[PDB]
Structures are given as structure tokens and as C-alpha cells.
Amino acid sequence: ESARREVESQAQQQLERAKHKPVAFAVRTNVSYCGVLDEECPVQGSGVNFEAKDFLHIKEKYSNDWWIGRLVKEGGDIAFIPSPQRLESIRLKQEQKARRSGNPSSLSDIGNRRSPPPSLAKQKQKQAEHVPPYDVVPSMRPVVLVGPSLKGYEVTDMMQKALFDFLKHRFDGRISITRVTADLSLAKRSVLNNPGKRTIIERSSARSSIAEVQSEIERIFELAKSLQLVVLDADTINHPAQLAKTSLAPIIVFVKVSSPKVLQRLIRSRGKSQMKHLTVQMMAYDKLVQCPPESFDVILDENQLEDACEHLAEYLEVYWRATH
Amino acid sequence: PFFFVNIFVALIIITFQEQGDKMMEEYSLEKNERACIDFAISAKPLTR
Amino acid sequence: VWAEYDPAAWGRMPYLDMYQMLRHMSPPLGLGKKCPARVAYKRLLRMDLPVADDNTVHFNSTLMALIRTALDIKIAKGGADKQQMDAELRKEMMAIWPNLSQKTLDLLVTPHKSTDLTVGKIYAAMMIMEYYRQSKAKKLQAMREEQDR
Amino acid sequence: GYMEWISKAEEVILASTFFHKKERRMRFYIRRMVKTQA
Amino acid sequence: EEEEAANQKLALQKAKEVAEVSNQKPAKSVWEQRTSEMRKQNLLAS
Numbered sequence: 001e002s003a004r005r006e007v008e009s010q011a012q013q014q015l016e017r018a019k020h021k022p023v024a025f026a027v028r029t030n031v032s033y034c035g036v037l038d039e040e041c042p043v044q045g046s047g048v049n050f051e052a053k054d055f056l057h058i059k060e061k062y063s064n065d066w067w068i069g070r071l072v073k074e075g076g077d078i079a080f081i082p083s084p085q086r087l088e089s090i091r092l093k094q095e096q097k098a099r100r101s102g103n104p105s106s107l108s109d110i111g112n113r114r115s116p117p118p119s120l121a122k123q124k125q126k127q128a129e130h131v132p133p134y135d136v137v138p139s140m141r142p143v144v145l146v147g148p149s150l151k152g153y154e155v156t157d158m159m160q161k162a163l164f165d166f167l168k169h170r171f172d173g174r175i176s177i178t179r180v181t182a183d184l185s186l187a188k189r190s191v192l193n194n195p196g197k198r199t200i201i202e203r204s205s206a207r208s209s210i211a212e213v214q215s216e217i218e219r220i221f222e223l224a225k226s227l228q229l230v231v232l233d234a235d236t237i238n239h240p241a242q243l244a245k246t247s248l249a250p251i252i253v254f255v256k257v258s259s260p261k262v263l264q265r266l267i268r269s270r271g272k273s274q275m276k277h278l279t280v281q282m283m284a285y286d287k288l289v290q291c292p293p294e295s296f297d298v299i300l301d302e303n304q305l306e307d308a309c310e311h312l313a314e315y316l317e318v319y320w321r322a323t324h
Numbered sequence: 325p326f327f328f329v330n331i332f333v334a335l336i337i338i339t340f341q342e343q344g345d346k347m348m349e350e351y352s353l354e355k356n357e358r359a360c361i362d363f364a365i366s367a368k369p370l371t372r
Numbered sequence: 373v374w375a376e377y378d379p380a381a382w383g384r385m386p387y388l389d390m391y392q393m394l395r396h397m398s399p400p401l402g403l404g405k406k407c408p409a410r411v412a413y414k415r416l417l418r419m420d421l422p423v424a425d426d427n428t429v430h431f432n433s434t435l436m437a438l439i440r441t442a443l444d445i446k447i448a449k450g451g452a453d454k455q456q457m458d459a460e461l462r463k464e465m466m467a468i469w470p471n472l473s474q475k476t477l478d479l480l481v482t483p484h485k486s487t488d489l490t491v492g493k494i495y496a497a498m499m500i501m502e503y504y505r506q507s508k509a510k511k512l513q514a515m516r517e518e519q520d521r
Numbered sequence: 522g523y524m525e526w527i528s529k530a531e532e533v534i535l536a537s538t539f540f541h542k543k544e545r546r547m548r549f550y551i552r553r554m555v556k557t558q559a
Numbered sequence: 560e561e562e563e564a565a566n567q568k569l570a571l572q573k574a575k576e577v578a579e580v581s582n583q584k585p586a587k588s589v590w591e592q593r594t595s596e597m598r599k600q601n602l603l604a605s
Contacts, residue, residue, distance in 0.1 A: 074580040155527075162530035257523060266523050298576060302569060303522030305529060315576040322579055338590045347586065351464055355596045357443050358468075364435045364480060365469065369383060370375035 011043050014060070015068065015078055023057045023070070025225075028135035028249065033087065041080050042066060048079035056081050057139070057323070074322045084134040091133065092123065129190075137249050138224035140323060143167075143231035143316075144243065145253035148263065149285035151235050153277060154270045155263075159255045160233070166309050167231065171316075176223055179233035186213045187246035220248065229316065239288065240295040251319075252297045253312065260285060373397060374431055384428035387491055391416075400442050413495045415441060421491040422482050429491065436480050455484065 029052060036047025042062070048071060050056065055072040058081060062068055069081035082090065095101045102121035104113055119125060145163060147156035167175055186209075196206040205211075223230040232250065237243045240252055257263045260282065267274050267281060274281070293299060298315055300308050351358075373396065375381045377389060394403040394412065403412050419437040421429055440447065446457040462481055465472060482488075538544045587595075 072579075158527040158530045161534060162526060165530070165533050262523065266527075269524060269527075299572065301572075302565065305522075305526050307569075311573060314573070318576055318580050339588050340590065341586060342589050342592065350467060352460075353445060357439075357445050360439045360443060361436070361445075361465070364432060364439055365472070365476075367432055367435055369378075369381040369431050371381055372375070372379055 008043060011062075015043075015046075018060050018068065019078065021059060022227075023059050023139065026055060026057045026137055026139050027069075027081070027084075028137050029054055029056065029133070030131065030135070031087070031091070031133060033082070033090070035080055035082055038082070038090070040065075043080065046077070046079055048081060055137075072322050074318070084132060087133040088123065135249075136247060138221050140224050140227075140229055140319070141251040142220050142224075142248060143229070143253060144234060144237070144250045145231075145255060146238060146240070146288065148256045148288065149281050150238055153281065154274055155267050155281070162305070163253075163255070163309075163312065164231075164233075167312070170313065174228055176228045176230050177233070178219075178223065178230055180216060181235065182216065183209060183213050183236050184216065184232070184234045184248075185237055185242050185246075186210055187217055187243070187248060189247055217247065229319070238284065240291055244295070252295070254288075254296045254299045254301075255308075256289070256299070256301060257285075258301065258303070383431045384424065384426070385431075386427055387423055387429050387494065390429060390434070390491070401438055410499075413499055416495045417492045418447070419491060422484075422488045423491055423494065430479065432476075432479055433482060458484065 029050065032051045034047065034049040035041065036045075036049050038047065041047055048056070048069065050071060056069040057072065058067045058069040060068045062080075063083075065083050065086045067081045067083060068078060070076060070078055099106050102115065102117050104115035145160055147159055150156055151160075164177065168177060196203055196208070196211050199206055199211065220230065220232070234243075243250065257266065263285060264278070264282065267278055298312065300311055302308055302311075373393070374385075377393065378385050391412065394415075395405050395407055396402065398404060403415065418441050421434055421437050423429065439445070446461050448454050448457050458481060462477060465477065465481070535549060538548065
């Protein structure tokens with residue numbers, strides 16, 4: 001048929017002219033689906049075989065079923081990503097190939113109970129959580145580095161400011177530093193339509209700190225859309241799970257001492273002031289160690305300044321090559 | 325005469341390299357087993 | 373000691389005198405005059421010397437296994453691993469002693485035939501018979517102490 | 522290693538002896554000189 | 560040995576972040592060889 005070939009050429013021409021255009025926004029995936037094996041794509045042979053925990057960057061507009069996106073892998077070509085409605089449609093296609101999907105079991109019961117599919121067998125039900133296949137995340141990851149024990153104290157604050165200095169100096173002109181003075185752990189998306197929309201409601205949450213924390217989420221989004229990498233100097237979050245389920249989904253950097261025996265004497269090197277808070281300083285350390293390493297993105301487990309300095313330098317250098 | 329001289333004697337003793345052997349590193353056990361089995365090789369019962 | 377037991381010292385001694393031999397000798401190579409019988413048989417089971425048709429054991433072959441069992445040389449716990457380790461040991465000696473005659477190697481490292489009656493097999497049988505006799509003796513006592521009520 | 526870590530971090534943020542601010546910067550500068558290979 | 564082991568272990572963990580873009584030993588002395596053997600033999604007793 002000439003119609004399929006004509007749209008094949010038009011899509012190819014559109015891709016060629018859009019190779020040097022700015023990126024619009026990015027999506028989040030939570031299911032291992034490959035877009036190259038689906039025959040409904042407009043162009044065959046140019047799909048995306050992306051697994052879970054992956055980044056996709058959509059640039060232009062195609063339709064309500066497919067989008068033009070790109071991978072954050074180095075050398076990744078322009079591919080096609082299914083729309084969130086398309087994934088919901090193909091998600092329904094996943095369990096329809098099975099013998100049964102609703103209530104009527106096939107345990108030697110054929111022709112007795114036909115059991116036509118009610119609303120229970122469709123996606124209308126199971127809406128207690130109903131996690132979307134796509135989540136909105138900033139274009140490029142904010143850099144959140146967690147202190148070995150507890151932020152806001154001398155020993156921990158000394159750890160990040162040294163790294164804060166290097167990222168500002170070596171990478172000047174392309175990195176923006178922002179400090180999140182207020183809380184950031186109250187990032188919720190499925191609580192209510194608009195908790196505390198106005199400050200004149202005099203509600204419990206209207207006069208609370210949730211309004212400012214909610215307003216701080218989109219600022220990180222704004223910094224991401226302008227192509228410069230950003231960091232987060234959040235002084236409250238101390239665990240990966242505290243800021244893992246949120247919509248930020250940021251890069252997590254770990255600074256840790258090899259042994260608590262080193263940390264306790266390092267705390268002692270400050271003076272008598274930290275001796276009052278030394279007790280709470282230690283239970284806050286081993287808790288982070290007990291967290292699985294796979295939750296963290298990068299680990300700085302060594303000792304010297306310079307080698308640890310270059311460890312983060314080359315890591316985001318990959319991130320800059322990858323998204324360019 | 326007492327301390328430094330004994331340092332030299334100790335340092336040579338500790339770091340005396342093994343006499344050649346050309347470093348085959350093909351045999352597994354060596355150690356005491358190498359000499360003990362060699363005794364089994366050339367073992368002659370005493371004769372009255 | 374070995375030459376003293378056999379005044380002629382031909383190089384072969386009855387297997388029975390080995391048990392008396394190893395008790396006179398001091399550990400680790402010997403067993404000691406105070407060695408329990410069960411511990412002595414346990415070492416002999418690992419020693420695994422084949423017995424000649426004249427019921428005698430060779431001097432050199434006996435010496436190897438006493439070295440073998442005391443230094444834990446390439447000693448597998450059983451199975452086909454024994455043949456693999458023995459072949460590996462045979463290669464190493466040929467690499468270390470290329471001039472070693474094949475007869476001497478077969479005399480020191482005996483090729484294991486399943487039909488061969490080893491010293492371990494002889495001591496395994498008597499221990500099994502002793503265990504069976506003791507188990508039968510206990511059973512007869514058990515059926516008797518339970519019958520007097 | 523970590524004692525070296527905080528030393529440079531403390532160096533950055535800091536950038537009678539207490540009364541004279543010019544003395545505080547001066548002791549900051551002479552502290553640099555001593556570790557120089559020269 | 561520790562700095563060698565830490566070197567290889569780090570560069571392998573470092574290579575994970577790089578995956579997207581994509582031995583020397585002097586002969587031991589007689590004192591050290593025998594000392595190592597005596598360590599194993601004594602540790603064999605346990």
C-alpha cells in the first residue's frame with residue numbers, strides 16, 4: 001500500500017528536520033516494555049527497547065498514541081515511545097492472551113457459567129491506587145547528596161560544602177546551585193485535588209508549611225527545562241526512602257566513612273560542641289549504612305579528597321555526554 | 325655496636341631471597357610436603 | 373623401627389603387625405601406645421594401602437600414605453575425586469622428578485583397582501562386624517531388660 | 522584522609538588577632554604558604 | 560595489598576557509572592614463605 005509508505009517517508013522527513021531541536025519534556029516508566037516489537041508503530045525498525053528505571057525525552061508532537069522520544073544512553077538514536085493511553089491499551093493486551101482474566105476460572109468449567117465480563121474485569125476498577133504508567137519528572141536530575149550521619153551539624157556540613165565548591169568551580173557556567181532551606185519530604189501527588197489552594201481559607205493545611213513545599217517542587221522543574229544541571233541543598237532529608245517515592249526521583253550521592261571508629265574520632269576533632277550531639281550523631285550513621293547500596297546512585301566510599309573529587313566529576317561527565 | 329648492628333643482621337635474615345629455583349609456579353603444595361615425599365622416594369630399610 | 377620388626381628387611385611385612393607397629397610409634401606419624409582402637413582404625417581407613425597376595429605391605433608404599441594422611445596431601449573426602457587428585461599428584465611428581473621410574477611411581481602411588489583388597493577394607497569389615505556384634509549384643513540385652521517386668 | 526577533607530572545606534568558607542580582621546585574613550594567607558613545596 | 564584491592568574494587572564500582580558511555584609481585588623471602596606456611600599449619604588446628 002502507498003499510504004503506509006507515504007507516512008513512512010513523512011515521519012522520516014519529520015525526524016530528520018527535528019534532529020537539532022530543543023527537548024520538550026521527559027517521562028517516567030515503571031513497566032519493562034519495548035517499543036520496537038510493537039507493529040502499530042508508525043515506523044518499523046526505529047523503536048526503543050527500554051527497560052524499567054529508565055529516562056525518555058520526548059521532543060515533538062505526533063499523535064495521541066505515539067510520541068517521538070530519545071534515550072539517555074550515550075549514542076541512543078531517536079525512537080518512538082507509546083503514549084500513556086497506548087500503554088494502558090497495551091497493558092490490557094498483556095493479560096488477555098492468558099486463558100482467563102476475570103472471575104470465571106477454567107478449572108474444567110466450560111459451557112456452564114459463561115460469566116460475561118462486568119465492570120470488575122476492566123480497568124475501571126482497581127482504582128484504590130491506580131499508579132499511572134507515566135510520571136512527570138524534571139528533565140535532568142537534581143543532585144542530592146546525603147551526609148554520612150546527619151546534616152546541619154559541623155562534621156556533615158563540612159562534607160558537602162567541599163563537594164559544593166568543586167562542582168561550582170570546575171563546572172562553572174553550566175551548573176546552577178540552589179539551596180532548599182524548607183522541607184522537601186512532603187511531596188505528595190495522590191492525596192487530594194488541591195490541599196490548601198488559597199491562603200485565605202484558614203484551613204489546617206492552608207496555614208501549614210505544605211503550601212511552600214509544594215511550590216518548591218516546580219522550581220526544580222523550571223531549572224531542569226533550561227538545560228543546566230541543578231543540585232539540592234536540602235537540610236532535612238537524610239535517607240533515600242525519604243525522597244524516593246516523590247516525583248523528583250533525583251540522583252543520590254553518598255559520602256560515607258569506611259568505619260564508625262573513624263567517624264567518632266573525626267567528630268571529636270571539631271571540639272566540645274559536637275560532644276553534646278555525638279550520641280544522636282551515631283544512630284543516624286549506621287541507619288544509612290543498613291540501607292541497601294542499590295538504592296543509592298553513586299557511592300563515595302574512599303578517603304582522599306582528590307580521588308573522591310574526580311569520582312563525581314566523571315560520573316556527571318557521562319550524564320552530560322549521555323544527554324547531548 | 326648493640327642496636328644498629330643487630331638491625332643489619334635482622335634485616336638480611338628477614339629479607340633473604342630464596343636460592344634461585346627459577347620460579348616455576350606450576351606445582352601446587354610444595355612447603356613441607358615437597359621434602360617429605362622426597363624422603364619416601366629414596367627410602368632404604370636398614371639392613372642387618 | 374621398620375627394619376627392626378623384620379630382621380631380614382626384605383621390604384614386606386604382614387598387615388597385622390602394622391596395628392602393633394603404629395602404637396609403639398609416637399605421634400604424629402605414629403598413633404601412640406595409649407591410642408584408642410577406634411581412632412587408630414579411623415586413620416587406617418584414610419590410609420588406604422592395598423594388600424599384596426601374600427598378605428604383606430611394602431615399606432615404601434606404607435611410608436607414602438603415612439605421609440599422605442599426616443600432611444593432608446590432596447586428600448579428597450571420597451568419590452571420584454580421589455582418582456582425579458591421584459592423577460594430578462602423579463603429574464606433579466613427573467614434573468618434579470622426570471627420572472622417576474614408572475614402576476616406582478606405581479609402587480609409591482598405587483593405581484586404585486576396585487578389586488584390590490586394601491588395608492582400609494580389612495579394618496572397615498572388622499569394625500562393621502564389631503559394630504554389628506555390639507548392636508546385636510545390645511538388642512539381645514534390650515529385649516531382655518524389657519521382658520523382666 | 523577525612524581530616525584532610527575538612528581542612529580544605531574550612532579553608533574555603535573562611536575566605537588583638539580577633540579584633541583586626543586584616544590579621545584574620547593574614548593568618549589565613551600565611552597558613553597557605555607553609556604547605557608549599559618551596 | 561589493601562591499596563591495590565581498594566584500587567581495583569573502586570575502578571569496578573566507578574565503571575558502573577561509565578557503563579552507559581562505554582599483576583606485579585616480587586619474590587617472597589625464605590622468612591616470609593615459611594612464616595606463611597606456619598600460619599596455615601597453626602590455623603589448621605583451629
